[PDB]
Design a binder for this molecule. Structure first.
Ligand SMILES: [Mg+2]
Ligand SMILES: [Mg+2]
Ligand SMILES: [Mg+2]
Ligand SMILES: [Mg+2]
Ligand SMILES: [Mg+2]
Ligand SMILES: [Mg+2]
Ligand SMILES: [Mg+2]
Ligand SMILES: [Mg+2]
Ligand SMILES: [Mg+2]
Ligand SMILES: [Mg+2]
Ligand SMILES: [Mg+2]
Ligand SMILES: [Mg+2]
Ligand SMILES: [Mg+2]
Ligand SMILES: [Mg+2]
Ligand SMILES: [Mg+2]
Ligand SMILES: [Mg+2]
Ligand SMILES: [Mg+2]
Ligand SMILES: [Mg+2]
Ligand SMILES: [Mg+2]
Ligand SMILES: [Mg+2]
Ligand SMILES: [Mg+2]
Ligand SMILES: [Mg+2]
Ligand SMILES: [Mg+2]
Ligand SMILES: [Mg+2]
Ligand SMILES: [Mg+2]
Ligand SMILES: [Mg+2]
Ligand SMILES: [Mg+2]
Ligand SMILES: [Mg+2]
Ligand SMILES: [Mg+2]
Ligand SMILES: [Mg+2]
Ligand SMILES: [Mg+2]
Ligand SMILES: [Mg+2]
Ligand SMILES: [Mg+2]
Ligand SMILES: [Mg+2]
Ligand SMILES: [Mg+2]
Ligand SMILES: [Mg+2]
Ligand SMILES: [Mg+2]
Ligand SMILES: [Mg+2]
Ligand SMILES: [Mg+2]
Ligand SMILES: [Mg+2]
Ligand SMILES: [Mg+2]
Ligand SMILES: [Mg+2]
Ligand SMILES: [Mg+2]
Ligand SMILES: [Mg+2]
Ligand SMILES: [Mg+2]
Ligand SMILES: [Mg+2]
Ligand SMILES: [Mg+2]
Ligand SMILES: [Mg+2]
Ligand SMILES: [Mg+2]
Ligand SMILES: [Mg+2]
Ligand SMILES: [Mg+2]
Ligand SMILES: [Mg+2]
Ligand SMILES: [Mg+2]
Ligand SMILES: [Mg+2]
Ligand SMILES: [Mg+2]
Ligand SMILES: [Mg+2]
Ligand SMILES: [Mg+2]
Ligand SMILES: [Mg+2]
Ligand SMILES: [Mg+2]
Ligand SMILES: [Mg+2]
Ligand SMILES: [Mg+2]
Ligand SMILES: [Mg+2]
Ligand SMILES: [Mg+2]
Ligand SMILES: [Mg+2]
Ligand SMILES: [Mg+2]
Ligand SMILES: [Mg+2]
Ligand SMILES: [Mg+2]
Ligand SMILES: [Mg+2]
Ligand SMILES: [Mg+2]
Ligand SMILES: [Mg+2]
Ligand SMILES: [Mg+2]
Ligand SMILES: [Mg+2]
Ligand SMILES: [Mg+2]
Ligand SMILES: [Mg+2]
Ligand SMILES: [Mg+2]
Ligand SMILES: [Mg+2]
Ligand SMILES: [Mg+2]
Ligand SMILES: [Mg+2]
Ligand SMILES: [Mg+2]
Ligand SMILES: [Mg+2]
Ligand SMILES: [Mg+2]
Ligand SMILES: [Mg+2]
Lengths: 205, 129, 158, 225
RNA sequence: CCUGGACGAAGACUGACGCUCAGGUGCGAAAGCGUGGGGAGCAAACAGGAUCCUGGUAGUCCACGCCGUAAACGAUGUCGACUUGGAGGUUGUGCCGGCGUGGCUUCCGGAGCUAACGCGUUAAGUCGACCGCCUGGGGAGUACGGCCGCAAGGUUAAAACUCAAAUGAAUUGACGCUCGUGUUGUGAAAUGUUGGGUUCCCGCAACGAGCGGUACAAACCGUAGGGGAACCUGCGGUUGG
RNA sequence: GAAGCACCGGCUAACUCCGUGCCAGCAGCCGCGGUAAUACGGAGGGUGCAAGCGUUAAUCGGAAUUACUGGGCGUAAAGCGCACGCAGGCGGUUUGUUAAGUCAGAUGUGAAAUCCCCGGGCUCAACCUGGGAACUGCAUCUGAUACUGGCAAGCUUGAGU
C-alpha cells in the first residue's frame, strides 16, 4: 500500500526535486538528478501528450505518497466540490494529516511524518489519530503527545523546517510542539510549477 | 403547396440578407407583422411597412452594419410537422443570451427574455441571432 | 513570445519513373495566448525542414478571437469539408477537454476552459481548419451590441 | 474635382457591352444604350473625390503610392504621370509575386543596381562574345519590369490600379497584405476586390490621362505641405 | 373519325374546394407464354460447309389474355417558396426590325453547396409538407414461408459461416534534373519546368537558384437459348468505354 | 512476523543484450520470426498497479455506427419504373367564442431507501444517519388565450370553372 523502493529514483524520473529526503544534502550530491534512472536513463526520448499528463500525475502522487486508488478518490471529491477542481484537488491533498505534520516541521519527510502518524504519536484536538489520510479541518490544533516529545526525530525536524519556507496558512509552535491549521491554502500558497489542469484533463479522458 | 408561411418569411429574410438585398417584400399576415415588430424592437431590422388591404404585402428593411449581414442565423424551430412548446423554466437561451428566441406567449408574441420576465411559456416560433 | 505547437507529421509519397519519392508534411499551430491563433502547413522532404516551414506559415495568417477570460462567448459549431466541430464555454477549472488536434489549437489561442467535441472525420488538418473557422465567426457582446442598435446593458443586462 | 460634362468628354460614362456585364456593377450603371452599358457619372464624382481625399491624407503623412497600368495606351501614359508625382509605377506586365515574394523581388532589385553600376560606373569593358550582350539584355529586361520600383525599397502603402479586372493579380497580392487598393472599375470588373472603387472607363486613352492627372497632382499637393 | 393533356391574351365566376400519400388500383421497353391467324426481311436454337459462310425454326407482325422485369437513368421522389447572371433553341402574346411580357427546353457560369467530381433559378443553393429507402464486404435479393403466375419466374425476405476490408472521388507515375519563396487545392500534389518560335527568345502566378483501357503500383442490365461451350448467340436498353 | 502481478513495436507510460532463424512461438488491432528480433524465450534495466495483479465472459460508453436531441439517399449502401388515390400526416387569409392542445397559478399525490445538497456519528474512509432538494409524473380546480385544433361567417392570392 506504499512505495518501499529507492526514493531518488522517483525524483530522477520526474526530473525535479520531490522532497523525498530531509534536504540535509543537496539533491545532486546524492544522485544524478538530471538523468533518468536505469541503463537507458542517460538518453532523453520524446514524450507525448499522455506522457506529460501521466508524469504530472505521478509527480504529485509521489510527492504526497498516495497510490492511484486513494488519489482517484481525491479527484472524485475534488470534481464534486464547488469551484475550481484543480485548486480543491491540491487543497484536499494538502489537508492530509501526514502532510500537515510535515508542513509544520514535526517530521523531516512526509514518509517520516507518515510513520509518526501511524505510530500513535500525533494528537489532533487532544485525540490520537493514526490514520495518514485523516483530513484536518481549519482551526484544528495538532500536537505531539508528551510520550513522543523525547524523540530526536521531532527535535531535528524543526531545524529543517526553519530552513524551508514556512507556510502562511499554518501556525507552528515548536516550543509546545503543537500547531494550528489556520485555513485551507490557496493555489498561490503552493508551488506554481505543479500543474493541476494536466491532472484534471488526464482523469477526464 | 405553401404549408408554412412563417418559415417562408424567415427564408426570405435569410436569402435577402445573404444576397445583400435592400428590402424584402412578401404577403402580409397578422402573425408576420407581429414577428416583424419583434425584430425591429431588438434591432435585427430597420423598419417594416404594410401596404394594401385586399392583398396586404409586408415590406421589410434589412440591416447591414459593416459590409456584413446583421442577421447571421435565423432558424425556424417549431414547424407544422413538429410543434414545439416550452414552459417558462425551459425557455432556451440562444448564444447564452446574445441571440433572441421569438416565443408566442398567451399575452402575445415577444422574445424569450420578455417571456421570462412575464413568466410565460408558449410556442418557440424561431431563433434569431 | 508566442506559444507554438506541432500537431501532426505525415510521410507522403509520389511516383516517378525512377521510383517513389518521399516527403514529410507537418501541421503546426501558433498563438500568443491572448486571442490570436494561426495554423500553418509546412511541406518539405526533411522533418526539421518541414516543421520550420509550418511555423513560418503559422506565424503569419493569424486571426483574432474574442475570449471571455479564457472561455468562449457562446457555444459555436465549426464546420469544414469533412469535420464537424462543436465547442462550448465551460466553468472555471474544467480545462481543455477536446481531441488531439482541437486541444492544440485551443491551448495556443488562449482558451483555458472549454467543452469541445469532434463529429465526422477527424483528419487533423480538417479539424484544425474547422476549429479556426468556428472561432473566427464568434462574436463578443460588444460586437452584437454594435450590429444591433442597443447597448451592452440592453443586450445582456436587460 | 472633375465636372460631369468633362468626364462625358473623357468617356468615363462609356462602358463595355451588356453581354460581358458584371452583375456586381449593377448599382454603378446608369443605363444601357446601343447594347452598351453607361456608367452613372453621378456616383463616380463623390467616390472619386473621397478617393482623392484619402490619397491626400496618406501621402501627406509620408506613405508610398504604387501605380499599376499594363494597358497598351496606359503603359506609357502612367509612366509619364508617374515621375511628375515622384511615385512608383508598373508600366509593364505585373510579375506574379511582386508583393508576396518581396524578399525574392528584393534580390532582383539588388541584381539590377549592380547591373547598372558596371555599365555606368564600373566600366567593365568586357565582352567575351557572351557576357556583355547578355548583361545588356538583362539590364533592358529588368528595367522594363522593375524600373518603377527601384526607388521604393519597401512595401507600398497603397496601390492605384487601372482596369482592375485585368490587374486582378496585383489586387490579390494587396488584399493579402492589407494594403488599401484604388482601382478604376469598369462595368465588367469585380468591384468587391477594391476598397475605394472608382467606377470609370479604363479603356479610353483620354480618360486614363484624366485619372492620372487628377491623381498625380493631388499626390504632389498632399506632399507639398 | 373519336379523345387526353399543355400554353397564351383579356375578363367573368366558385371561394381553401389544398399538398403528400402506407395498403390499394391502373399503367408499364425488350424477351417469354396461352388461343387463333399472319409470316416478306431479319433471325436464338438447329443443320451443313470452313478456319466466319450457306440454309433456317421459334420469335419479331396481328387479335385477345398473361408475364410486371431493365444501367425502366437525370444512377437526382412529389409539391411550394425565396436567391447574381450570360448565350441558344422552341412555342405564345403586347407595343413601335426594335421593344417588353409568358411556358417548356440546351449550354456556360456567380454566390452557395459537395469528399472531390460537380450541381448551380430546371440546384446537388436556402427552407417547409409528405412518402419511399439505406446503415461493412461476401454469403444473397439466395434459402425457407406467404402471395402472385400456365410456366419461366416475380414480389416480400433471412441465417449460419467467412473476410478486415469492400467502395467513392481525385493525384502521382508506368503500361536534362531539382530546390528556395510565392501562388492554386481540405489534401495527396500542380505551377515554376503546361504554350508559340528558335540552347535561346517571348508570352506567362510565378519570381529566382542549384545541377546535368489497367480490375496496374469494350463493359454492363433485363430476358431467351446452346450438342464443335477455355464461353458464345438473338432482342431491347445504359455509358458507369 | 508481512510484495506480488502485468507490461516495455505502434495505439500506450517503459530497451538493451543473449539464444533461436518464417522453426519454436507471439497476437485486441496493425502484424512480428527465413542470421544484429526493443514484437519469440531468457536476462539486465525500466514502466504501470498493488494485497492484489492479469485473463475470460457480459453491459454501456467511445459508436453522430438506427442520429428524438443527433445521420444519410447524382457517382461511396440508399428515391419505389410511372401515375391516380383511400386511411393517415400537414395546410393561405379575416373576424366572432370554443378553451381541446399549449401556457400560468393553486391543490392532492408521486412509499421508504437510493442518487444530489447541507450537517452529524463511527480515530479517517467505506459505512451509518438528521434535514432538505429532487422525485423531470399524473389528476382536479382557477385563469390566460398569441399560436394549433373544433365551431360559425367571410375574403381571394392557393386550387379549379
Ligand atoms: Mg486497497
Ligand atoms: Mg468542481
Ligand atoms: Mg467523461
Ligand atoms: Mg424544424
Ligand atoms: Mg495515412
Ligand atoms: Mg467516421
Ligand atoms: Mg479514413
Ligand atoms: Mg492520415
Ligand atoms: Mg387534339
Ligand atoms: Mg359567391
Ligand atoms: Mg364575393
Ligand atoms: Mg403503393
Ligand atoms: Mg401495355
Ligand atoms: Mg398490362
Ligand atoms: Mg413481345
Ligand atoms: Mg405468342
Ligand atoms: Mg403462334
Ligand atoms: Mg420464320
Ligand atoms: Mg453436305
Ligand atoms: Mg447465319
Ligand atoms: Mg423461313
Ligand atoms: Mg438467312
Ligand atoms: Mg431449324
Ligand atoms: Mg408459329
Ligand atoms: Mg398484373
Ligand atoms: Mg428494379
Ligand atoms: Mg438514358
Ligand atoms: Mg433506381
Ligand atoms: Mg423549387
Ligand atoms: Mg454549370
Ligand atoms: Mg450530397
Ligand atoms: Mg451485414
Ligand atoms: Mg428469388
Ligand atoms: Mg395463386
Ligand atoms: Mg400455382
Ligand atoms: Mg416462389
Ligand atoms: Mg418466394
Ligand atoms: Mg481538387
Ligand atoms: Mg495551401
Ligand atoms: Mg474542395
Ligand atoms: Mg476506361
Ligand atoms: Mg445476359
Ligand atoms: Mg446487345
Ligand atoms: Mg430508357
Ligand atoms: Mg456502382
Ligand atoms: Mg512510448
Ligand atoms: Mg545467431
Ligand atoms: Mg539476434
Ligand atoms: Mg524485425
Ligand atoms: Mg505489446
Ligand atoms: Mg520478448
Ligand atoms: Mg526486470
Ligand atoms: Mg516494478
Ligand atoms: Mg486485503
Ligand atoms: Mg461496445
Ligand atoms: Mg448511440
Ligand atoms: Mg434526424
Ligand atoms: Mg451516413
Ligand atoms: Mg450506388
Ligand atoms: Mg425515378
Ligand atoms: Mg419504395
Ligand atoms: Mg415496383
Ligand atoms: Mg425494392
Ligand atoms: Mg400523386
Ligand atoms: Mg389520402
Ligand atoms: Mg385536418
Ligand atoms: Mg392555418
Ligand atoms: Mg382568435
Ligand atoms: Mg386546456
Ligand atoms: Mg380549462
Ligand atoms: Mg400546470
Ligand atoms: Mg408534491
Ligand atoms: Mg445516474
Ligand atoms: Mg465521527
Ligand atoms: Mg467525521
Ligand atoms: Mg439520507
Ligand atoms: Mg430524511
Ligand atoms: Mg419536500
Ligand atoms: Mg421518495
Ligand atoms: Mg379567458
Ligand atoms: Mg384559436
Ligand atoms: Mg381559430
Amino acid at each position: 500500500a506504499r512505495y518501499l523502493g529507492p526514493k531518488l529514483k522517483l525524483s530522477r524520473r520526474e526530473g525535479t526535486d520531490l522532497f523525498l529526503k530531509s534536504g540535509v544534502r543537496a539533491i545532486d550530491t546524492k544522485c544524478k538528478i538530471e538523468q533518468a534512472p536505469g541503463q537507458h536513463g542517460a538518453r532523453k526520448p520524446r514524450l507525448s501528450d499522455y506522457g506529460v499528463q501521466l508524469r504530472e500525475k505521478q509527480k504529485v502522487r509521489r510527492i504526497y505518497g498516495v497510490l492511484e486508488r486513494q488519489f482517484r478518490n481525491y479527484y472524485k471529491e475534488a470534481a464534486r466540490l464547488k469551484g475550481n477542481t484543480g485548486e480543491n484537488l491540491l487543497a484536499l491533498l494538502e489537508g492530509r494529516l501526514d502532510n500537515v505534520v510535515y508542513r509544520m516541521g514535526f517530521g523531516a519527510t512526509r514518509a517520516e511524518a507518515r510513520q509518526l502518524v501511524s505510530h500513535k504519536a500525533i494528537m489532533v484536538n487532544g485525540r490520537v489519530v493514526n490514520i495518514a489520510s485523516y483530513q484536518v479541518s481549519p482551526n484544528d490544533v495538532v500536537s505531539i503527545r508528551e510520550k513522543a516529545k523525547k524523540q530526536s526525530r521531532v527535535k531535528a525536524a524543526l531545524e529543517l523546517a526553519e530552513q524551508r519556507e514556512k507556510p502562511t496558512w499554518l501556525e507552528v509552535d515548536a516550543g509546545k510542539m503543537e500547531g494550528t491549521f489556520k485555513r485551507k491554502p490557496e493555489r498561490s500558497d503552493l508551488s506554481a510549477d505543479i500543474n493541476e489542469h494536466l491532472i484534471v484533463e488526464l482523469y477526464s479522458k | 403547396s405553401m404549408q408554412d408561411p412563417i418559415a417562408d418569411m424567415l427564408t426570405r429574410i435569410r436569402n435577402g440578407q445573404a444576397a445583400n438585398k435592400a428590402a424584402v417584400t412578401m404577403p402580409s399576415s397578422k402573425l408576420k407583422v407581429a414577428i416583424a415588430n419583434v425584430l425591429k424592437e431588438e434591432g435585427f431590422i430597420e423598419d417594416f411597412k404594410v401596404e394594401g388591404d385586399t392583398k396586404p404585402e409586408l415590406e421589410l428593411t434589412l440591416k447591414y452594419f459593416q459590409g456584413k449581414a446583421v442577421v447571421e442565423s435565423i432558424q425556424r424551430v417549431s414547424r407544422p410537422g413538429l410543434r414545439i412548446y416550452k414552459r417558462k423554466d425551459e425557455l432556451p437561451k440562444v448564444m447564452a443570451g446574445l441571440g433572441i428566441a421569438v416565443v408566442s406567449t398567451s399575452k402575445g408574441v415577444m422574445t424569450d427574455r420578455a417571456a421570462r420576465q412575464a413568466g410565460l411559456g408558449g410556442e418557440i416560433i424561431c431563433y434569431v441571432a | 513570445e508566442l506559444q507554438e505547437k506541432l500537431i501532426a507529421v505525415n510521410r507522403v509519397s509520389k511516383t516517378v519513373k525512377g521510383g517513389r519519392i518521399f516527403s514529410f508534411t507537418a501541421l503546426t499551430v501558433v498563438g500568443d495566448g491572448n486571442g490570436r491563433v494561426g495554423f500553418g502547413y509546412g511541406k518539405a522532404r526533411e522533418v526539421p525542414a518541414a516543421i520550420q516551414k509550418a511555423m513560418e506559415k503559422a506565424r503569419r495568417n493569424m486571426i483574432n478571437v474574442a475570449l471571455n477570460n479564457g472561455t468562449l462567448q457562446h457555444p459555436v459549431k465549426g464546420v469544414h469539408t469533412g469535420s464537424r466541430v462543436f465547442m462550448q464555454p465551460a466553468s472555471e477549472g474544467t480545462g481543455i477537454i477536446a481531441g488531439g488536434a482541437m486541444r492544440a489549437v485551443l491551448e495556443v489561442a488562449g482558451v483555458h476552459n472549454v467543452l469541445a467535441k469532434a463529429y465526422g472525420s477527424t483528419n487533423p488538418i480538417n479539424v484544425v481548419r474547422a476549429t479556426i473557422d468556428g472561432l473566427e465567426n464568434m462574436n463578443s457582446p460588444e460586437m452584437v451590441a454594435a450590429k444591433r442598435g442597443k447597448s451592452v446593458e440592453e443586450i445582456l443586462g436587460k | 474635382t472633375v465636372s460631369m460634362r468633362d468626364m462625358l468628354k473623357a468617356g468615363v460614362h462609356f462602358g463595355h457591352q451588356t453581354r460581358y456585364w458584371n452583375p456586381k456593377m449593377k448599382p454603378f450603371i446608369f443605363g444601357a444604350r446601343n447594347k452598351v452599358h453607361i456608367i452613372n457619372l453621378e456616383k463616380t464624382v463623390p467616390m472619386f473625390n473621397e478617393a482623392l481625399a484619402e490619397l491626400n491624407k496618406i501621402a501627406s503623412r509620408k506613405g508610398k503610392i504604387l501605380f499599376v497600368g499594363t494597358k497598351r495606351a496606359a503603359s506609357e501614359a502612367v509612366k509619364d504621370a508617374a515621375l511628375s508625382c515622384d511615385q512608383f509605377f508598373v508600366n509593364h506586365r505585373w510579375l506574379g509575386g511582386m508583393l508576396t515574394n518581396w524578399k525574392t523581388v528584393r534580390q532582383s532589385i539588388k541584381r539590377l543596381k549592380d547591373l547598372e553600376t558596371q555599365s555606368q560606373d564600373g566600366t567593365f569593358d568586357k565582352l567575351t562574345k557572351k557576357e556583355a550582350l547578355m548583361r545588356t539584355r538583362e539590364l533592358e529586361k529588368l528595367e522594363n519590369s522593375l524600373g518603377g520600383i527601384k526607388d521604393m525599397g519597401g512595401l507600398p502603402d497603397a496601390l492605384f490600379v487601372i482596369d482592375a479586372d485585368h490587374e486582378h493579380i496585383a489586387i490579390k497580392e494587396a488584399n493579402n497584405l492589407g494594403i488599401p487598393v484604388f482601382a478604376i472599375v469598369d462595368t465588367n470588373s469585380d468591384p468587391d476586390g477594391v476598397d475605394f472603387v472608382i467606377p470609370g472607363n479604363d479603356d479610353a486613352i483620354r480618360a486614363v490621362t484624366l485619372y492620372l492627372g487628377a491623381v498625380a497632382a493631388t499626390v504632389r499637393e498632399g506632399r507639398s505641405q
